[PDB]
Amino acid sequence: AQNPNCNIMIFHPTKEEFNDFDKYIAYMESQGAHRAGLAKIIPPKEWKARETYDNISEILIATPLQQVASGRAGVFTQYHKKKKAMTVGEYRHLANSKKYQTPPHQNFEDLERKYWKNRIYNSPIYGADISGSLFDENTKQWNLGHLGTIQDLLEKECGVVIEGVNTPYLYFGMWKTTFAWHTEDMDLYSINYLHLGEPKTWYVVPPEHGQRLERLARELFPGSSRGCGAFLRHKVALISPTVLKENGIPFNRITQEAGEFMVTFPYGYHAGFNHGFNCAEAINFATPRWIDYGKMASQCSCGEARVTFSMDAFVRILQPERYDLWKRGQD
Numbered sequence: 281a282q283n284p285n286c287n288i289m290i291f292h293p294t295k296e297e298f299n300d301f302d303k304y305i306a307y308m309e310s311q312g313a314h315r316a317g318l319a320k321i322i323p324p325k326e327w328k329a330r331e332t333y334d335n336i337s338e339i340l341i342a343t344p345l346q347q348v349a350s351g352r353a354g355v356f357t358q359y360h361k362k363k364k365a366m367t368v369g370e371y372r373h374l375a376n377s378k379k380y381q382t383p384p385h386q387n388f389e390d391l392e393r394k395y396w397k398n399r400i401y402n403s404p405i406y407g408a409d410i411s412g413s414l415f416d417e418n419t420k421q422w423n424l425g426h427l428g429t430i431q432d433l434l435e436k437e438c439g440v441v442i443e444g445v446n447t448p449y450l451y452f453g454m455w456k457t458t459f460a461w462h463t464e465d466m467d468l469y470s471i472n473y474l475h476l477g478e479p480k481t482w483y484v485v486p487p488e489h490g491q492r493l494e495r496l497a498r499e500l501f502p503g504s505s506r507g508c509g510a511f512l513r514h515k516v517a518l519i520s521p522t523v524l525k526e527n528g529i530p531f532n533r534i535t536q537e538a539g540e541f542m543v544t545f546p547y548g549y550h551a552g553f554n555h556g557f558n559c560a561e562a563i564n565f566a567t568p569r570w571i572d573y574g575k576m577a578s579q580c581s582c583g584e585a586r587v588t589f590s591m592d593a594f595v596r597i598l599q600p601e602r603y604d605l606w607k608r609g610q611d
C-alpha cells in the first residue's frame with residue numbers, strides 16, 4: 281500500500297507530464313497521494329497561468345464577508361457578515377491597512393502560532409466565492425476554467441446525461457481569513473491555484489480517518505450536532521492543531537505559496553488560513569474513483585448548507601433515497 285502513513289506528497293511534473301491533467305491525477309493516486317487528503321503540485325518552470333497580474337484591480341467583490349468568531353481560541357465557530365461591495369484594488373488597500381495587515385513575524389511557524397493564539401479577537405474580511413477565472417485563455421495546461429466537467433464525468437461513467445455546469449471561483453484573502461473544516465460538496469475533489477500574494481496554510485485529515493474528526497466535532501459543538509446530522513457542511517467550525525493533537529485526531533499541515541496548486545481528494549477534511557493579501561482560484565472536479573464517494577456522501581437537510589444548482593442532479597442520480605429530504609432542505 282503506497283503512502284501508508286498518509287503524508288502530504290509534493291509533486292514536480294515536467295512540462296510533458298503537465299499536458300494530460302486526468303492522467304497526472306491518476307499518477308499521483310498510484311503513488312498514494314490521496315491517502316493524505318491533500319497534495320501539492322509545483323508546475324514546471326516553463327509554465328505560467330497568465331502574463332501579469334497588473335490589471336486585476338477593477339474586479340468587483342460584490343459581497344465581501346466579515347468573518348466574526350465565537351468560542352475559544354482553539355475551538356470556535358465563524359459567521360459571515362455581509363459588507364458593502366468593493367473592488368479588488370480597494371480590498372487590497374484594506375488588507376494592507378494597519379488594522380488588517382499581517383503582523384511582524386519570524387517565519388511561517390511563528391505566524392501560525394500567532395494565528396491560533398489571536399484569530400478569534402479579530403474579524404478579517406474575505407472576498408470569497410466570486411465566479412470567474414484569472415487563467416489566460418491561451419494557457420492550455422492546468423487551466424481551471426478548461427477542465428472536463430463533473431457532469432460529463434458522471435455521463436461517461438454512469439451513462440446518464442444531466443443538467444448543470446461547473447465553473448471556477450476566485451478568493452481574495454487577507455491576514456487571518458479562514459476556511460472552516462469541510463469536505464467538498466458531494467465529497468468531490470477540489471483544485472486550488474494560488475495566483476498571487478501571501479501564502480495559505482492548510483490542515484487536512486486523511487479520508488480514511490474522516491469519521492474521527494466528525495465524532496470530535498459532535499463533542500465540541502454539541503448544539504450544532506443536535507441541529508444537523510452533517511453540520512460540518514455548514515462550513516463554520518474551526519478546531520486548532522493543538523486541540524486535534526490532544527484528542528488523537530490524525531492530520532497533516534502544509535503551506536501553499538504563490539504559483540503552486542493544491543488538490544484535495546474525496547472526503548479529505550480540510551481547513552486553513554491566509555497569511556496576508558492573496559488571490560486564489562478553485563474548482564471542483566471528479567474522476568472515476570470519486571463515484572463511490574459521491575454515492576456515500578453525507579448531506580445537510582436542515583436548510584443551512586444551501587448549495588449550487590448543479591448539486592441537485594448529483595443527489596438525484598447518486599442518492600435517490602435521500603433526494604426528497606435533501607431537496608426540502610434546499611426549498
Ligand SMILES: O=C(O)CNC(=O)C(=O)O
Pocket residue numbers: 451458459470471472544550560562563
Ligand atoms: O481557499 C479557500 O478559502 C478555501 N478553498 C478550499 O476549500 C478548496 O480549495 O477546496
Ligand SMILES: [Mg+2]
Pocket residue numbers: 335336337338339
Ligand atoms: Mg481589473
Ligand code: NI
Pocket residue numbers: 462463464470544550
Ligand atoms: Ni475545500
Ligand SMILES: [Zn+2]
Pocket residue numbers: 507508509510511513514580581582583584585
Ligand atoms: Zn445542516
